[PDB]
């Protein structure tokens, strides 16, 4: 009593993400930098993530936004006209990002703020995307040969890439197999991939 499968594959997930991440509005470098500084500060504060998500109202807000304190306000200033009205084409990709971030832990939000601050989004994006592509089918537990250290990522217990993946429910090792795919990790790994792709897209 439905069409297609319950679950997409990596190609389908990447296509879904790219309908947003590859169709973003163009931002001038100064506006782009202010937006990224704002998002970095929002990722470091659980209340700022909530306040920003509430202000955007999934793109349904009518009327000028209420001014917010701190980083959530700094992001809102990059998405509104001088009147305080939200621009849907600027706000809707941020709504998708906030939606994906709801699946991630506070530890992962702080690591994404560090990745943003250090302009290191592509490394983690490639690692997560490669693990999602190579772990087909996601319903089955499997050991993988991909060694994250050989892709230029720091790898070992407590390294940023290690914590980011461990927080998804993957089983990690310092020796091969470095990563074991667990079906329980599907949602968090997909959300992490979408969040890194959107942050990379927003960074232009």
């Amino acid at each position: 009593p439905a069409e297609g499968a319950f679950t997409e594959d990596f190609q389908g997930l990447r296509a879904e993400v790219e309908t947003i991440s590859k169709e973003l509005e163009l931002l001038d470098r100064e506006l782009c930098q202010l937006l990224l500084e704002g998002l970095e500060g929002v990722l470091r504060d659980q209340l700022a993530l909530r306040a920003l998500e509430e202000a955007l109202e999934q793109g349904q807000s009518l009327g000028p936004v209420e001014p917010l304190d701190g980083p959530a306000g700094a992001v809102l200033e990059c998405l509104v006209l001088s009147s305080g009205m939200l621009v849907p084409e600027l706000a809707i990709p941020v709504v998708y990002l906030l939606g994906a971030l709801t699946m991630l832990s506070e530890t992962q939000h702080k690591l994404l703020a560090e990745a943003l601050e250090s302009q290191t989004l592509l490394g983690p994006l490639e690692l997560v995307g490669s693990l999602l592509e190579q772990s087909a089918p996601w319903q089955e537990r499997s050991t993988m040969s991909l060694p994250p250290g050989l892709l230029g990522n720091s790898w070992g217990e407590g390294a940023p890439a290690w914590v980011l993946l461990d927080e998804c429910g993957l089983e990690l090792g310092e020796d091969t197999p470095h990563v074991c795919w667990e079906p329980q990790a599907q949602g968090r790994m997909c959300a992490l991939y979408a969040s890194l792709a959107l942050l990379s897209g927003l960074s232009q």
Partner: peptide, 11 residues
């Protein structure tokens, strides 16, 4: 050839 695109700037 050239093409016109919309670019958002800080006020």
């Amino acid at each position: 050839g050239c093409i016109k695109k919309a670019v958002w700037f800080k006020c």
